């Protein structure tokens, strides 16, 4: 009901406390663009007029510089009938994308590690991020970095996909899914585990994106010169050694990709492409040895029952 600032110009260095402690008062105003400078000087805030916006106190809604009377009708609740000036989400995600595209070494590492927290504790940043090719940024750094940089990028990305808007952003971004399949060939077992379970939440969120996944694998197979699905079955052939765990993730993924697809004609397409590469020899060979763990065995018979 009263006004206050929060200095959030550097999203990698947000102070948490809004100042002033005892809020200065202003109560009415009805266009907002022309009215924001009065309050920006009322507060004398170290925030660039320009790139500023206003967020409602309890709810977090960011006002459109329109009408108070139309945002009214959008949303306050009953209390009015008886507020923070900060930087635009646009400007903050620009500083994020800037840092990621322009730094290296230790700064870069720190920043990617912080992305998880930044997105976790300001949820509304994730849509604007998707709007600014933030996914193109993440991949276009990750496809050229070592497995540690990649595992931070993947933690950030999993955070994004916990939110509906981030999930939709990856559903739009084909390069993301392609990168995750490429990552199933990583020499880092951590990176592979992570990529796989992100691919799992991706195919479990919806069903329409089972085809999106199958196409990403086909697209990378075509660019790279390899047969489609070589990364999954390569994980299946435990060439790094035993990994019951990774095997269970890989087989459950291929299962629910099959079970969520209406084309029996595309399903026979993909299951041919993969028994070609040795799938059935692997399935029987694992189904025999009693060292097979129950989780895994359950899922391999799911595969066979499909066949």
């Amino acid at each position: 009901v009263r006004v206050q600032y929060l200095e959030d110009t550097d999203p990698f260095a947000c102070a948490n406390f809004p100042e002033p402690r005892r809020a200065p008062t202003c109560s009415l105003d009805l266009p907002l663009g022309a009215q924001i400078p009065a309050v920006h000087r009322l507060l004398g805030a170290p925030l660039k007029l320009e790139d500023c916006a206003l967020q409602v106190s309890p709810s977090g809604y960011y006002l459109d510089t329109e009408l108070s009377l139309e945002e009214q009708r959008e949303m306050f609740y009953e209390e009015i009938s008886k507020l923070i000036l900060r930087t635009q989400l646009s400007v903050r995600v620009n500083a994020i994308l800037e840092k990621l595209y322009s730094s290296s070494g230790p700064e870069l590492r720190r920043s990617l590690f912080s992305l998880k927290q930044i997105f976790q504790e300001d949820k509304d940043l994730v849509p604007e991020f998707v709007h600014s090719e933030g996914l193109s940024c993440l991949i276009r750094v990750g496809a050229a970095a070592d497995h540690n940089y990649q595992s931070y990028i993947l933690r950030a990305l999993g955070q994004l996909m916990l939110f509906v808007d981030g999930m939709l952003g990856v559903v739009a971004h084909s390069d993301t899914i392609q990168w995750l399949y490429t990552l199933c060939a990583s020499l880092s077992r951590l990176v592979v585990k992570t990529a796989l379970k992100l691919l799992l939440v991706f195919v479990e969120y919806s069903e329409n994106n089972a085809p999106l996944f199958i196409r990403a694998v086909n697209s990378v197979a075509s660019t790279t010169g390899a047969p489609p699905w070589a990364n999954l079955v390569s994980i299946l052939e435990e060439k790094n050694g035993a990994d019951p765990e990774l095997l269970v993730y890989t087989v459950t993924l291929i299962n629910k990709t099959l079970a969520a697809l209406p084309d029996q004609d595309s399903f026979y397409d993909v299951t041919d492409a993969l028994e070609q590469q040795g799938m059935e020899a692997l399935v029987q060979r694992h189904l025999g040895t009693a060292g097979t763990d129950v989780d895994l065995r359950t899922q391999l018979v799911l595969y066979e029952n499909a066949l």
Partner: protein
Amino acid sequence: PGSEDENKLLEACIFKNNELLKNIQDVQSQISKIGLKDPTVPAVKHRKKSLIRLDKVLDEYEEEKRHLQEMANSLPHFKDGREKTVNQQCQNTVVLWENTKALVTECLEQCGRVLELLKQYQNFKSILTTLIQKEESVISLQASYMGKENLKKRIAEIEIVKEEFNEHLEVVDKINQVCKNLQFYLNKMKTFEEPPFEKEANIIVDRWLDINEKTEDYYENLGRALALWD
């Protein structure tokens, strides 16, 4: 009353106002010159010991301020109207006192919160660096130069270590926030050649990541070596 006694009262009011006003101005000059030696608990509470001395000084002037307001609201009414100007200066001096007292309260408030945050910083840093030193000193043989039972034994140890790392990851987030807030409240007190707790945040985060990445590489090497013993 009388024009002589009226002017002698008016002049006494001017005298007390000038005297009180410069005493308050002196207190506020002293406030601005306090500063802060270092971002340490000893330095911060030396700053606060000084703010509290000055708080008591303003307190000793409260009763003079209050007698002054008395005189101003009881001043004689001259045809000239000069009583009105002196009353306005007196009201100014009173507002000055209220403002100086509010300043001291704000400095004392930010001292209090910096002190809570410095406490939290040292508790979190102890937790983290003792975890990091614990893993950092334990031996790590080459996985290539280890027997099968020793690989199994070390792998089990490295899962315990990893799970504790996962648990204190929240503490890493908390200390990053504590350092961020410490910068904010600390810039209010002094201008720092280099940002005060930004170096510290980066150093602790860097150590944490180094030991996590090192331990994860060691884990995957232990597994690959174990695979050769069938």
